[PDB]
């Protein structure tokens, strides 16, 4: 309730670039505090690349300029230079670079989940996906494509789309979700920044990272599960190594489920199942302590959840589930459920920790409903944490102050909070609105 | 009681606070004038003095149920219009009579998966047009049939996008045609021979991921109206496949984020916006299938029965059948589904104003009486059978001072009952 909603800061990008599809805080120290915005449809100065996508750096102080991860066009096949006509070995056009943007310390991870390549054998069109990792404040740039392996095509990791979802741990470990691996069984892959740089050799296209953790191929009964559709991190195993939370929205007869994996050996620890078929339970996941007991609690979104009005009419509203952790573990059934009230509102499409917004000792949460509102522009709900868990009523409701237009705004489809952008002691919030190519920054004012 | 505890300062306030309250006008009564209808006479209040406005029920349109007639000339529900004046907290109940028509036309649209796993199936359907039309001849005197095909969204990663695989998504020997979202091969017609002719020309296709994009097609069939040629009769949509289904959210893998708009986008009988709009959600299909009165028959293989069994529970007016190896049993499947769908009625009402509530009580054959959510439906309704519903409406506020109106209708029919509401707020 202490976010400055009457006058937020609006960042604007190029038209049609989907500027705001992904948002993130960047701070190599404190002096260079900045906002990162992904624009997956942005045109770039890369030669021969159409709408390669871009990431914009927006320093906070007094605007936005694109970061140059890769200035090169699509590389050429080795043996094509023998034949009559050079041909690309990869396809960076329409790769959606910047679909996911995450940062940890002076490192920035930007992913292109629709990046595809030919392979150097039989011609394919494998969307293996790729990520670029900047380190030490843009002094070294690395490419990281863990799914670009010996095992090609849908049967292997050819359609992995690695980087479709991503996140950093507290130690800076990279965690990637690739929902397309092994006939869309899905896959989690992870490697330390040291491990990635140690085996980085751009002359060879295939990934050779040693010590890399990754989930294993299962039987065909698990196909089309989209494991790794969304990802988050949090401690759930009782040690000091953050664990991996992964959404599996089409698992178990498309009732969907969320899984927690051991950050040490990626082995499965817990499962949480949805309550309705094709509700997309696991569309979005988050981990944060919402009741100040020191144990990270789980939040899951199911934006297609369909309930009935009192007069008997069905309606798509969406629903969020909260699982409170306790010293013995976690219960499979939710402690609390939050239900949207806007038809086709898609409540629970995005979730982000807010830290402690009002400094009352309990961390708070923001939940997006990209198509909520009286004009379907989108809405963001702030829910207060407390000793009994998250509150069932919002403490604040954020909406765009600009008028609706010919196209949806998608306001609230991308969220990021839990960090202090201006150093006033109160955490702040970034809201994406890529439909109109805008990102909004809400600041926490000291209030009562 | 709550009549005295209301402290009614006028005749008006007394009415909206409790249905059991009356107002004394005598001036010989020793806010105490607002008491129970019994508590006033016990205190010496003349009945000619106790003002007590009461709700009422007035039928306005009441064509009797029917027993050579056009579909619009057939009455299956009565009354068709009535007025209910509502006292706050006092329910008004009225009877709804439903009768299943003797002979009613049928539109059946056959929407078929033409992905590669449906290769052997397409060969058996070569005579489905004339064979089905023969069977329906002993069910209805007016039958029409249509045919549509679907595969998948025409974008990465759902299809392979190499130039060769775009021309032929299958192997070299296999002469598969290019992948396509949805094709309206044949609009509804009474010529079964044309169905055989055009279905016999269609070519099997293919794609990459096992779940297919039939939901995009179902949506189009549901909302495209005249392009399909739906009549205001029994509308059957047979959905034949051997795979699971994509739904909203799956589109995001291909960068498709716009929700389905539920609008018609056929150009040259081809769906042209599969690359632009995401797959519909089940809830979105529920809305549009119901709105356009489409009754869905899911003719799916044995292994996907569990999935489509759950889908049927979510979709009103839908049925599931086990499709044989290559659609050899599809006709009997359709007949069994129709008999099941037509023998059950389900009532739905429009949105009510806040403070207003509705309740159903069904009275079916063999003395089977339903209440709660079961009060909305009757089953085992044979041809010519009559069932009745007792429908109560109660207002607990004073919504507006203007009259409200909403419709009650059985799913799958244009016929409806217009219920006009009027609220007693003053004496």
């Amino acid at each position: 309730f202490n976010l400055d909603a009457e006058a937020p800061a609006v960042l604007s990008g190029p038209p049609g670039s989907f500027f705001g599809f992904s948002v993130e805080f960047y701070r190599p120290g404190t002096d260079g505090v900045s906002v990162l915005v992904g624009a997956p449809k942005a045109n770039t100065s890369q030669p021969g690349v159409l709408q390669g996508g871009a990431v914009y750096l927006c320093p906070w102080g007094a605007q936005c300029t694109p970061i140059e991860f890769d200035s090169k066009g699509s590389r050429l096949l080795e043996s094509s230079l023998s034949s009559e006509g050079e041909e690309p070995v990869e396809y960076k056009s329409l790769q959606w670079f910047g679909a996911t943007v995450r940062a940890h310390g002076s490192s920035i991870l930007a992913c292109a989940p629709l990046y595809s390549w030919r392979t150097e054998k039989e011609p394919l069109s494998d969307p293996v996906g790729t990520c670029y990792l900047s380190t030490d404040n843009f002094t070294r740039i690395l490419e990281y494509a863990p799914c670009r392996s010996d095992f090609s095509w849908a049967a292997g990791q050819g359609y992995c789309q690695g980087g479709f979802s991503a996140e950093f741990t507290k130690t800076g470990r990279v965690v990637l979700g690739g929902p397309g691996s092994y006939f869309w069984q899905g896959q989690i892959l992870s490697a330390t920044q040291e491990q990635i740089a140690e085996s980085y050799y751009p002359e060879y296209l295939i990934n050779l990272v040693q010590g890399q953790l990754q989930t294993r191929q299962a039987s065909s009964i698990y196909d089309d599960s989209y494991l790794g559709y969304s990802v988050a991190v949090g401690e759930f195993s009782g040690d000091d190594t953050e664990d991996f939370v992964a959404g599996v929205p089409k698992g178990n007869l498309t009732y969907g489920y969320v899984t927690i994996l051991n950050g040490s050996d990626i082995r499965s620890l817990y499962n949480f199942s949805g309550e309705q078929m094709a509700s997309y339970f696991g569309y979005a996941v988050a981990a944060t302590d919402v009741n100040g007991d020191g144990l990270d609690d789980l939040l899951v979104g199911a934006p297609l959840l369909m309930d009935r009005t009192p007069d008997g009419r069905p309606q798509e509203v969406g629903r969020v589930y909260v699982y409170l952790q306790h010293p013995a573990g976690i219960e499979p059934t939710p402690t609390l459920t939050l239900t949207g009230h806007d038809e086709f509102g898609r409540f629970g499409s995005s979730l982000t920790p807010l830290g402690d917004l009002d400094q009352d000792g309990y961390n708070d949460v923001a939940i997006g409903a990209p198509f909520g509102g009286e004009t379907q522009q989108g809405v963001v709900f702030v829910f207060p944490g407390g000793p009994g868990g998250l509150g069932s009523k919002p403490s604040q409701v954020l909406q765009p102050l600009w008028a609706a237009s010919h196209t949806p705004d998608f306001f609230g489809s991308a969220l990021r909070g839990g960090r202090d952008l201006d150093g006033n002691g109160y955490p702040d919030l970034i809201v994406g609105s890529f439909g109109v190519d805008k990102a909004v920054v809400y600041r926490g004012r000291p209030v009562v | 009681n709550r009549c005295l505890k209301a402290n009614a300062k006028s005749c008006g306030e007394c009415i909206q606070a409790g249905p059991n309250c009356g107002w004394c006008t005598n001036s010989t009564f020793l806010s105490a004038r607002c008491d129970d209808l019994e508590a006033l006479k016990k205190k010496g209040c003349p009945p000619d003095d106790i003002e007590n406005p009461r709700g009422s029920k007035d039928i306005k349109k009441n064509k009797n149920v029917t027993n050579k007639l056009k579909p619009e000339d057939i009455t299956q529900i009565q009354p068709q219009q009535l007025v209910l004046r509502l006292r706050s907290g006092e329910p008004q109940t009225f009877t709804l009579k439903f009768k299943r028509a003797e002979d009613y036309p049928i539109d059946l649209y056959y929407l078929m998966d033409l992905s590669y796993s449906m290769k052997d199936d397409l060969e058996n359907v070569k005579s489905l047009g004339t064979d089905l039309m023969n069977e329906m001849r002993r069910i209805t005197s007016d039958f029409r049939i249509g045919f549509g095909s679907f595969v998948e969204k025409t974008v990465m990663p759902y299809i392979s996008t190499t130039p060769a695989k775009l021309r032929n998504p299958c192997t070299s020997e296999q002469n598969c045609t290019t992948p396509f979202s949805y094709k309206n091969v044949l609009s509804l017609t009474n010529k079964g021979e044309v169905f055989n002719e055009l279905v016999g020309k269609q070519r099997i296709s293919g794609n990459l991921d096992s779940p297919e994009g039939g939901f995009d097609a179902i949506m189009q069939v549901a909302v495209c109206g005249s392009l399909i040629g739906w009549r205001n009769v029994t509308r059957l949509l047979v959905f034949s496949t051997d795979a699971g289904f994509h739904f909203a959210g799956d589109g995001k893998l291909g960068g498709i984020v716009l929700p389905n708009d539920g609008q018609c986008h056929l150009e040259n009988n081809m769906y042209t916006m599969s690359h632009y709009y995401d797959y519909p959600s089940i809830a979105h299909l529920v809305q549009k299938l119901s709105e356009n009165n489409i009754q869905t028959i899911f003719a799916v293989t044995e292994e996907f029965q569990p999935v489509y069994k759950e889908l049927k529970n979510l979709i009103p007016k839908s049925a599931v059948g086990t499709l044989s190896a290559n659609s050899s049993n599809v006709i009997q499947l359709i007949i069994d589904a129709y008999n099941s769908l037509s023998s059950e009625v389900i009532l739905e009402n429009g949105k009510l104003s806040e403070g207003v509530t509705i309740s159903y009580k069904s009275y079916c054959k063999n003395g089977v009486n339903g209440t709660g959510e079961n009060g909305r439906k009757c089953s085992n309704i044979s041809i010519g059978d009559e069932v009745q519903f007792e429908i109560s409406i109660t207002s607990n506020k004073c919504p507006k001072k203007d009259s409200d109106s909403f419709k009650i209708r059985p799913l799958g029919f244009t016929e409806e009952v217009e219920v006009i509401l009027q609220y007693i707020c003053e004496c």
Partner: peptide, 6 residues
Amino acid sequence: GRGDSP
């Protein structure tokens, strides 16, 4: 029988 295949 994985993907779109019999």
